[PDB]
Design a binder for these strands. Structure first.
Ligand SMILES: [Mg+2]
Ligand SMILES: [Mg+2]
Ligand SMILES: [Mg+2]
Ligand SMILES: [Mg+2]
Ligand SMILES: [Mg+2]
Ligand SMILES: [Mg+2]
Ligand SMILES: [Mg+2]
Ligand SMILES: [Mg+2]
Ligand SMILES: [Mg+2]
Ligand SMILES: [Mg+2]
Ligand SMILES: [Mg+2]
Ligand SMILES: [Mg+2]
Ligand SMILES: [Mg+2]
Ligand SMILES: [Mg+2]
Ligand SMILES: [Mg+2]
Ligand SMILES: [Mg+2]
Ligand SMILES: [Mg+2]
Ligand SMILES: [Mg+2]
Ligand SMILES: [Mg+2]
Ligand SMILES: [Mg+2]
Ligand SMILES: [Mg+2]
Ligand SMILES: [Mg+2]
Ligand SMILES: [Mg+2]
Ligand SMILES: [Mg+2]
Ligand SMILES: [Mg+2]
Ligand SMILES: [Mg+2]
Ligand SMILES: [Mg+2]
Ligand SMILES: [Mg+2]
Ligand SMILES: [Mg+2]
Ligand SMILES: [Mg+2]
Ligand SMILES: [Mg+2]
Ligand SMILES: [Mg+2]
Ligand SMILES: [Mg+2]
Ligand SMILES: [Mg+2]
Ligand SMILES: [Mg+2]
Ligand SMILES: [Mg+2]
Ligand SMILES: [Mg+2]
Ligand SMILES: [Mg+2]
Ligand SMILES: [Mg+2]
Ligand SMILES: [Mg+2]
Ligand SMILES: [Mg+2]
Ligand SMILES: [Mg+2]
Ligand SMILES: [Mg+2]
Ligand SMILES: [Mg+2]
Ligand SMILES: [Mg+2]
Ligand SMILES: [Mg+2]
Ligand SMILES: [Mg+2]
Ligand SMILES: [Mg+2]
Ligand SMILES: [Mg+2]
Ligand SMILES: [Mg+2]
Ligand SMILES: [Mg+2]
Lengths: 172, 170, 203, 116, 48, 119
RNA sequence: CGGUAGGGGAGCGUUCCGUGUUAGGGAGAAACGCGUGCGUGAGCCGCGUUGGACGAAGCGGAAGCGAGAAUGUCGGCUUGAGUAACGCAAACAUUGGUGAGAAUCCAAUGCCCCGAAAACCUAAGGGUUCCUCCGCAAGGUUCGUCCACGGAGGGUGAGU
RNA sequence: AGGGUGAAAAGAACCCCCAUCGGGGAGUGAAAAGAACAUGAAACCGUAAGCUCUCAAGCAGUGGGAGGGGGACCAGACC
């Protein structure tokens, strides 16, 4: 089916009391970084947000380990985003009878961990092949095996996707 | 069966291996072998040679616009009244006939020259939105227009040869 | 650092494959020189005969352009600058298009010997303004021609080029030198045709 | 501006800054090492050393000078006792400054000033 | 003085990105610092 | 019988929004702006379908003038055209422009017929 | 066969009623999303790796029947902006302790402020805010292990 | 002012992150519909992929369309 099924562990923190912007200022850094580096960084950062984000990330690591059985060394943070939560409004008094609105923003944070080494068999083997060699190799195997081979991250990384559908190498 | 097998093996056993989907049976055909070139011809075809036409073109008048026609090609024109699909028509207003060997220039028309074309279709154009608008006078009018159109195919250009040619001769 | 890892290797290889297949099936470019009405290949293509021709990127490529040289000695400033503008803009080619540069390069030499009628040498006035108040500066034509004489012709042609993006980019094709010599001999400049009668002044 | 105004202001007015520095030194001489803010430490160097250099001479005059700086007598007497022994050979440089992870609440850079 | 208009979505997105770039330099200092304390050789630094 | 407006509005809005796809900024977002922008688009379109017929004759003529000017010293667009008519040829300006580019030799011939006959 | 004020003609749609407990519909209705479909347009017709139970067409009837403007109006969400500010210029400091976490909670040692009060008590008022144990969502202009906050359990004794 | 988890609370045992909240598996269920829970438009906040902007003057579009990319079956078309 899809690479989203094999590599990925998703984790949602809900209702963290960081305001979305602040939390973004941390999350933008750790996007695309090895789980180890991201740990040490989030240990020493100045900001407040880094602490909940840390608890989160550590958790998602335990999940990739225990549930889908991944090696912690091979974890990178593939996709991480913050979205607005439920805002709680409160009214406060001001000078001369005017009021004002305070909002105490929350957010959801979604961290998506992705193993690199999963698929690596197909990966490095398909790297091994020149563009003609690979087509000649797929000239044998059934539609089943073709689909099973190329179902790695391969087509995307090297930007072959629309090419192979044009070579009549596939069905949609 | 190799799809059900490799999917159940990528299902039951996490972290799939290359040996299972591609067995070691297959070495691939050698890069210089006929059995390599039939595949690589299948999937990466060489561009086929262009179909033959006469080398000729004519400038013809339809519905008082002037087209350059080359045979084998279809063009769009004004609806031709009382023309039916699969109809053989002859366009008799012909201003200019080029051949890479010569060119015939009418005064005004090339005499006896005729263009045989067949009417392959009767259409309506892409809808053009005619929109009338005056600011602050609170008046807008949205009106579509679809022009009727005739799609014709030029087959052949004929009966020029007797007319005097000219040429650039250095 | 250019990675030779199997990944980037693979990627370039594949890209050259895509480029190969896209070059094979695409319609060949046939340059415009004694180019006859159509090649048996285009005839399968889109309709370029009953639509107005527009240039493709193979045409206007900078490397191909004509070079020209104007000896500006005893020429009349304006009348010359018109001709120059015409050729730079491309208005003398059948292939002209407003939206594209089909034009030439022009090299103007002996830019201090350029001739100007009337009392103009002492009267015509080149002003430029700082942008502060009382920031106006004025030169007579002659002070200018003694100080940096190329600016005169640059400033007279720039006026007749279009204004705006294509205008400015055009103006870079005007190469001016004060001396009788230019270091472009490699570009093989042809001389510039002048069909104007009054363009040549005599004393 | 300041060109060559060298003093450590510690973001307090004169009176307070004095009293603060006196305090911090009676602390350092009581406990021998303490945790503070980088600025406070750096500022406190000078006065630490003033006290030690003071005790190295030992005159009744000097002892009254130190008494009128440090708050707690007991720490002063112990200073005049220990110092000739511990620091006798050291010419200057009686304090080490070792910085740490910044504070949680304000993210003020911290530090450890040691009596060396 | 007030905002005669309201600030366009894209321009605001650029100003806020600038403010988010500071997180990037603080992430470099943080990284360098961890790699320091991770060799246990620094006598200027202390952790508990 | 009370009637909520329901979707009758939102459909209309949506069918407008489809129109305004790929307008930079708030022209692609807010309904109220999108309305106007639709109208203006439609309007320009109508206008410039008329401008179009002007501009290609502009163009064609220009290119033709260029193409001829090459031959004679003294030859023009004006001269040319006048000569095409007193020789009774029907070719309009689109055809002479496209033949000027795409078959130059042809135009040379035509010029040679007009010349021969004016001689 | 330009067209404002303005008059006349021809239409489209919305919810409901008649036909009708209709045709159709958990073999997927309304709706929501889509279209190289058809209209002079209002719109129609077709389609859905959404949705989960209703409901057309035709020929008629009725209106709380069509929105971009009312400094309209009610909710939602922006911009200003991670900006101004954080409520006196009595002043904090360090060492321990508790704790997942301490500039802010507890204790000790200093230092500083009020002292015709910023002290103790009583009228009015408030109404359980008092005390103990637990808690840290919201409240507290930061924090928070703490609280006049939340939860449970107590507490006010008169012949003068 | 605050209505509509499911037919039935069957309201999620057990393990993992773990101070709680919150989460990821497993299990219940036609469906997770997972308790801030039914359809879930727009504004508004983002994330990813395709093309593209740092000599530029502009109610942001439109007619012309260079170069690049995409899903086709009337592959000369559409986006
Ligand atoms: Mg008040
Ligand atoms: Mg206010
Ligand atoms: Mg009006
Ligand atoms: Mg004083
Ligand atoms: Mg004071
Ligand atoms: Mg000194
Ligand atoms: Mg109703
Ligand atoms: Mg209404
Ligand atoms: Mg566009
Ligand atoms: Mg009229
Ligand atoms: Mg009328
Ligand atoms: Mg009217
Ligand atoms: Mg209806
Ligand atoms: Mg209805
Ligand atoms: Mg029934
Ligand atoms: Mg349906
Ligand atoms: Mg209904
Ligand atoms: Mg419909
Ligand atoms: Mg109907
Ligand atoms: Mg049901
Ligand atoms: Mg009915
Ligand atoms: Mg309906
Ligand atoms: Mg009403
Ligand atoms: Mg409104
Ligand atoms: Mg207002
Ligand atoms: Mg409002
Ligand atoms: Mg905001
Ligand atoms: Mg500001
Ligand atoms: Mg400021
Ligand atoms: Mg400030
Ligand atoms: Mg204020
Ligand atoms: Mg305060
Ligand atoms: Mg006092
Ligand atoms: Mg009191
Ligand atoms: Mg009391
Ligand atoms: Mg009382
Ligand atoms: Mg209470
Ligand atoms: Mg109490
Ligand atoms: Mg709280
Ligand atoms: Mg708080
Ligand atoms: Mg605790
Ligand atoms: Mg209480
Ligand atoms: Mg659970
Ligand atoms: Mg605890
Ligand atoms: Mg839980
Ligand atoms: Mg489960
Ligand atoms: Mg089940
Ligand atoms: Mg919902
Ligand atoms: Mg410039
Ligand atoms: Mg540029
Ligand atoms: Mg610009």
């Amino acid at each position: 089916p899809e690479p989203g099924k094999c590599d990925e562990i998703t984790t949602r923190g809900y209702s963290i009391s960081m305001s979305v912007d602040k939390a973004r200022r941390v999350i933008d850094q750790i996007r695309g970084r090895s789980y180890a580096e991201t740990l040490m960084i989030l240990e020493l950062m100045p900001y407040r947000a880094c602490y909940p984000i840390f608890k989160l990330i550590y958790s998602a690591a335990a999940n990739a380990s225990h549930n889908k059985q991944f090696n912690k060394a091979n974890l990178i943070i593939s996709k991480a985003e913050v979205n607005k939560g439920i805002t709680l409004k409160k009214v406060k008094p001001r000078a001369r009878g005017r009021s004002y609105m305070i909002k105490r923003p929350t957010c959801h944070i979604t961290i998506v961990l992705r193993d690199i080494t999963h698929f690596d068999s197909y990966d490095k083997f398909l790297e091994s092949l020149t563009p003609k060699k690979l087509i000649a190799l797929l000239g044998l195997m059934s539609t089943g095996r073709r689909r099973e081979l190329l179902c790695g991250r391969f087509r995307e990384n090297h930007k072959i996707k629309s090419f192979l559908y044009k070579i009549a190498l596939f069905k949609r | 069966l190799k799809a059900e097998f490799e999917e159940f093996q990528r299902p039951p056993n996490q972290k799939p291996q290359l040996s299972d989907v591609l067995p070691d049976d297959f070495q691939a055909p050698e890069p210089g072998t006929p059995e390599y070139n039939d595949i690589i011809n299948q999937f990466l075809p060489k561009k086929g040679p262009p179909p033959p036409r006469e080398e000729i073109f004519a400038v013809v008048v339809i519905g008082s616009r002037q087209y350059i026609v080359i045979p084998g090609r279809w063009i769009y024109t004004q609806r031709l009244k009382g023309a039916t699909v699969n109809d053989k028509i002859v366009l008799n207003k012909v201003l200019l006939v080029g051949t890479k060997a010569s060119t015939y220039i009418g005064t005004p028309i090339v005499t006896n020259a005729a263009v045989h074309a067949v009417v392959e279709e009767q259409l309506l154009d892409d809808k053009v939105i005619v929109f009338k608008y005056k600011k602050k006078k609170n008046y807008r009018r949205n009106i579509g227009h679809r022009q009727p159109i005739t799609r014709i195919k030029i087959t052949g250009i004929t009966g020029y040869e007797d007319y005097p040619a000219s040429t650039l001769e250095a | 650092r250019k990675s030779t890892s199997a990944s980037t290797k693979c990627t370039e290889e594949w890209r050259q494959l895509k480029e190969a297949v896209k070059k094979e099936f695409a319609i060949p470019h046939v340059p415009l020189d004694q180019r006859w009405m159509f090649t048996l290949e285009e005839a399968t293509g889109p309709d370029i005969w009953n639509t107005t021709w527009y240039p493709k990127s193979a045409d206007h490529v900078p490397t191909d352009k004509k070079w020209y040289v104007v000896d500006a000695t005893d020429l009349i400033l304006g009348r010359m600058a018109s001709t120059i503008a015409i050729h730079i803009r491309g208005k003398n080619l059948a292939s002209y298009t407003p939206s594209v540069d089909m034009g030439a390069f022009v090299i103007v030499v002996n830019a201090d010997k350029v001739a100007v009628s009337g009392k103009k040498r002492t009267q015509k006035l080149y002003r430029r303004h700082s942008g502060r108040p009382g920031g106006l500066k004025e030169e007579t034509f002659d002070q200018l021609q003694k100080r940096i004489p190329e600016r005169i012709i640059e400033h007279a042609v720039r006026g007749m080029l279009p204004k705006g993006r294509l205008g400015r980019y055009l103006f870079n094709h005007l190469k001016v030198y004060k001396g009788a010599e230019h270091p472009h001999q490699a570009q093989q400049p042809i001389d510039l045709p002048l069909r104007d009668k009054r363009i040549r002044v005599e004393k | 501006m300041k060109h060559g105004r060298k003093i450590h202001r510690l973001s307090r007015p004169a009176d307070q800054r004095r009293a603060l520095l006196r305090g911090l030194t009676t602390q350092l001489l009581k406990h021998g090492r303490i945790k503070t803010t980088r600025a406070k430490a750096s500022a406190m160097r000078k006065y630490v050393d003033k006290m030690i250099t003071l005790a190295k001479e030992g005159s009744l005059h000097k002892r009254r000078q130190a008494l009128g700086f440090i708050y707690e007598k007991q720490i002063v007497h112990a200073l005049f006792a220990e110092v000739p022994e511990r620091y006798g050979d050291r010419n200057g440089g009686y304090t080490r400054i070792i910085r740490t992870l910044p504070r949680r609440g304000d993210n003020a850079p911290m530090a450890y000033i040691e009596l060396v | 003085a007030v905002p005669k208009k309201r600030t366009s979505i894209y321009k605001k997105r650029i100003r806020k990105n600038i403010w988010k770039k500071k997180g990037y330099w603080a992430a470099l200092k943080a990284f360098s610092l961890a790699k320091s304390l991770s060799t246990g050789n620094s006598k200027s630094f202390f952790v508990r | 019988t009370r009637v909520k407006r329901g979707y009758i509005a939102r459909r209309r809005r949506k069918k407008i929004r489809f129109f305004a796809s790929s307008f930079r900024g708030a022209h692609s977002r807010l309904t109220r702006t999108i309305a106007q922008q639709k109208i203006r688009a439609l309007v320009s379109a109508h206008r410039d379908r008329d401008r179009q017929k002007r501009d290609f004759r502009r163009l064609w003529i220009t290119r033709i003038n260029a193409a001829i000017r090459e031959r004679g010293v003294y030859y023009n667009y004006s001269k040319f055209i006048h000569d095409l008519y007193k020789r009774q040829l029907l070719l309009n300006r689109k055809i002479l422009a496209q033949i000027a580019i795409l078959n130059p030799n042809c135009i040379y011939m035509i010029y040679n017929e007009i010349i021969k006959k004016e001689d």
